[PDB]
C-alpha cells in the first residue's frame, strides 16, 4: 500500500558479486525456497520511498528482455540512525558470476576477441532495448554484466539506480566506466545525453575484457574523475586486436557525445554485426566458465 517491504525472512544476501558505481550487487537467496537472486543494494535518503516504488513499477516491464536480469521484487531495509535505509532490487540470478569474475579467472586476465564481441553485442542488445524505451542504465561495468550457467549475458539493473541519482541527488563508487559528459554534469536535468553515456561505458567494459581492467584503473579515483573529461579518449594498448575491435572502441569512446555514435549505429558496427553466429561462440564461452574456479 505505497510501501516497500523489509526483506527480513524473505531474502538474505549471501555474497558480494560487485561494487558498482551506483550501488552494490549481491548474490541473494530466498529464505524459504532457497532460490538464488541478484540483489542490487542502493542507499536511499528515505525522504522519497514511494517515488522509488513508482519508478520501479514504471521500469520493471523493461527487465523481461533476454539480456536484462528480470525484476523479481523490491524491498526497503529500514536501518537504524547513522545508517541510511537501503533499497534492495531483486532480479533473476546468474550462476557463472560477472564478466569481471570471468576476466579474473581467465589466464592472463584477457578474453578472446570472439568472446568480447559476443558479450559486447549482448550488452548492446539490452542497452538497445532500454534506450529504445528512453531508459538510461548508467551503471555498465563488467561487475554489472552477469553470465548465466549457459553463458547468456544479462545486465544488472534497468534504470532504477539512474532514477535515484535523479530523484535523490547522489552523494558513488569507482569512476573508471563513467563517460566524460556524465562527470562534467554539464546538463544534469534528465541527462539522457541521447543515451550515449552507456555506449562509452560499454567501450570501457570492452577494454576491461581486453586488458583485464578499465583504463585509469591504477590511478586514484579522484585523479581519474579529474582526467576522464580532460584527457583524450582511451584506446586499446595492443595491436594484436582486429581493426574491427579497435574501430568499435574508437566508436564507443568518442569524447564529444554528440559525435559519439548512437546505440543503433553501434549495433550495426562490423565488430558487432559482422561476427560469428551467436550460439556458435556462446558454447566456447560456456565450457570455459565451467572449468574456471570461483
Amino acid at each position: 500500500l505505497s510501501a516497500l517491504r523489509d526483506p527480513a525472512g524473505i531474502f538474505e544476501l549471501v555474497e558480494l558479486v560487485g561494487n558498482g558505481t551506483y550501488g552494490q550487487v549481491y548474490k541473494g537467496r530466498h529464505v524459504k525456497t532457497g532460490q538464488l537472486a541478484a540483489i542490487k543494494v542502493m542507499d536511499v535518503t528515505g525522504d522519497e520511498e514511494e517515488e522509488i516504488k513508482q519508478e520501479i513499477n514504471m521500469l520493471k516491464k523493461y527487465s523481461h528482455h533476454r539480456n536484462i536480469a528480470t525484476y523479481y521484487g523490491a524491498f526497503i531495509k529500514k536501518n537504524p540512525p547513522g545508517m541510511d535505509d537501503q533499497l534492495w532490487l531483486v532480479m533473476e540470478f546468474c550462476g557463472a558470476g560477472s564478466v569481471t569474475d570471468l576476466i579474473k579467472n581467465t589466464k592472463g586476465n584477457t578474453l578472446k576477441e570472439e568472446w568480447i564481441a559476443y558479450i559486447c553485442r549482448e550488452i548492446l542488445r539490452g542497452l538497445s532495448h532500454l534506450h529504445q524505451h528512453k531508459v538510461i542504465h548508467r551503471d555498465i561495468k563488467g561487475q554489472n554484466v552477469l553470465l548465466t550457467e549457459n553463458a547468456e549475458v544479462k545486465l544488472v539493473d534497468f534504470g532504477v539506480s539512474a532514477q535515484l541519482d535523479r530523484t535523490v541527488g547522489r552523494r558513488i563508487g569507482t569512476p573508471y566506466w563513467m563517460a566524460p559528459e556524465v562527470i562534467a554534469c554539464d546538463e544534469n536535468p534528465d541527462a539522457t545525453y541521447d543515451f550515449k553515456s552507456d555506449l562509452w561505458s560499454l567501450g570501457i567494459t570492452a577494454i576491461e575484457m581486453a586488458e583485464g581492467a578499465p583504463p585509469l584503473c591504477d590511478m586514484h579515483p579522484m585523479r581519474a574523475l579529474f582526467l576522464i573529461p580532460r584527457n583524450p579518449a582511451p584506446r586499446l594498448k595492443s595491436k594484436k586486436w582486429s581493426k574491427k575491435f579497435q574501430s568499435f572502441i574508437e566508436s564507443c569512446l568518442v569524447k564529444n557525445h554528440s559525435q559519439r555514435p548512437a546505440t543503433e549505429q553501434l549495433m550495426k558496427h562490423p565488430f558487432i554485426r559482422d561476427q560469428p553466429n551467436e550460439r556458435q561462440v556462446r558454447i566456447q564461452l560456456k565450457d570455459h566458465i565451467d572449468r574456471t574456479k570461483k
Side-chain angles (χ1 to χ4, degrees):
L1 195 72
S2 190
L4 293 176
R5 310 176 283 163
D6 189 292
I10 312 316
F11 281 103
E12 65 183 13
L13 307 183
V14 176
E15 190 192 5
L16 183 71
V17 165
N19 180 189
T21 309
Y22 297 117
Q24 280 182 299
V25 189
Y26 293 75
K27 159 176 164 194
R29 170 176 291 125
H30 197 291
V31 173
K32 298 168 186 164
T33 85
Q35 209 75 94
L36 286 64
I39 310 180
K40 186 166 170 182
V41 176
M42 284 156 294
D43 294 1
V44 288
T45 76
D47 186 3
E48 299 82 1
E49 157 167 354
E50 303 76 7
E51 193 157 357
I52 319 172
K53 193 174 180 176
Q54 193 50 57
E55 296 296 346
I56 296 176
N57 292 359
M58 298 277 199
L59 287 176
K60 50 176 178 171
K61 76 196 61 172
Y62 304 122
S63 62
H64 293 293
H65 186 289
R66 56 192 302 284
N67 289 123
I68 304 163
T70 298
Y71 174 77
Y72 180 101
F75 300 100
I76 289 194
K77 183 180 194 299
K78 294 183 189 294
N79 294 307
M83 268 261 96
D84 282 346
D85 301 355
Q86 300 188 305
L87 167 68
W88 290 15
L89 183 75
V90 187
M91 288 148 309
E92 73 184 296
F93 182 59
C94 302
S98 74
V99 162
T100 298
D101 294 337
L102 182 72
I103 296 165
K104 288 173 183 169
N105 304 347
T106 301
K107 300 300 303 183
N109 308 298
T110 172
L111 299 203
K112 182 56 209 283
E113 197 173 300
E114 296 204 343
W115 298 344
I116 306 169
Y118 168 61
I119 298 161
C120 278
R121 179 174 61 198
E122 298 309 293
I123 295 166
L124 194 51
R125 272 159 194 224
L127 282 183
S128 167
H129 181 73
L130 296 176
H131 297 180
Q132 183 187 3
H133 297 101
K134 295 170 64 206
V135 182
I136 61 183
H137 191 284
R138 195 146 295 186
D139 207 354
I140 300 295
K141 72 198 295 284
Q143 281 178 350
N144 287 339
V145 181
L146 299 189
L147 298 180
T148 73
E149 320 78 56
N150 317 99
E152 293 167 277
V153 173
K154 282 169 188 297
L155 302 182
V156 183
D157 201 359
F158 40 93
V160 182
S161 53
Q163 293 311 297
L164 291 202
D165 175 57
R166 296 175 71 246
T167 66
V168 286
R170 185 62 169 73
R171 64 187 189 78
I172 66 162
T174 49
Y176 307 123
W177 299 257
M178 270 166 81
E181 66 269 13
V182 166
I183 297 180
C185 222
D186 196 350
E187 21 155 353
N188 175 240
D190 49 355
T192 58
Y193 302 121
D194 305 326
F195 311 95
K196 298 294 189 52
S197 301
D198 290 336
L199 305 186
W200 172 291
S201 296
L202 168 61
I204 300 316
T205 307
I207 294 180
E208 177 188 359
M209 301 200 247
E211 301 185 359
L216 270 52
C217 192
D218 283 338
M219 294 190 340
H220 184 289
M222 192 82 91
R223 179 56 171 173
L225 190 85
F226 181 69
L227 283 188
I228 290 157
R230 286 173 186 66
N231 285 347
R235 296 294 173 245
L236 292 170
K237 62 190 175 185
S238 179
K239 292 300 174 200
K240 80 178 192 181
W241 306 113
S242 78
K243 291 94 79 191
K244 273 157 49 160
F245 193 14
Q246 290 187 12
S247 181
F248 179 67
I249 299 313
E250 186 176 351
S251 297
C252 290
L253 299 188
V254 172
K255 272 201 76 182
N256 189 192
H257 66 259
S258 63
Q259 264 140 29
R260 194 171 313 130
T263 314
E264 295 303 319
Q265 296 194 247
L266 201 69
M267 267 289 236
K268 297 189 83 61
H269 189 286
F271 178 68
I272 300 291
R273 183 190 55 187
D274 308 352
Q275 90 174 243
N277 178 62
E278 189 187 303
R279 190 184 183 173
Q280 198 179 309
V281 174
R282 165 160 150 255
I283 308 152
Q284 299 180 239
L285 186 72
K286 189 202 193 315
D287 39 13
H288 175 195
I289 301 160
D290 288 359
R291 305 179 304 244
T292 65
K293 306 307 187 304
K294 171 172 63 65

